[PDB]
Amino acid sequence: SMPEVSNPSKPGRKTNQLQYMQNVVVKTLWKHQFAWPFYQPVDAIKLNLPDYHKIIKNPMDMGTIKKRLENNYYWSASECMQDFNTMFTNCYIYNKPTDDIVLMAQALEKIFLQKVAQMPQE
């Protein structure tokens, strides 16, 4: 279902790894010429996609990830990684492998993986 960005019962914090996810991973991807389709939730009205929200049941976007980081919603950097992988997986599910949006997602995913690989230990 659509994703919350705060939850009073859910433990939340900002570790050194979560700070790295915000200040290095998200911020690097944000300043990329191909990031703009991912700043906000997919807009099925503007794109005229009657089936998007029938097929994609766990939507995710980088704006939601940013808000989760800003709210100290996560407990672990692994949860932030989860959200990025949901974002990419959804794009690859819904779109055809040759579409412009998939090529853009693949370029961002390559940078995501490089920055995660250089994340420091907790």
Binding site: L47, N95, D99, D100, I101
Partner: peptide, 6 residues
């Protein structure tokens, strides 16, 4: 089906 993008 999102079409052409830059």
């Amino acid at each position: 089906r999102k079409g052409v993008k830059s």
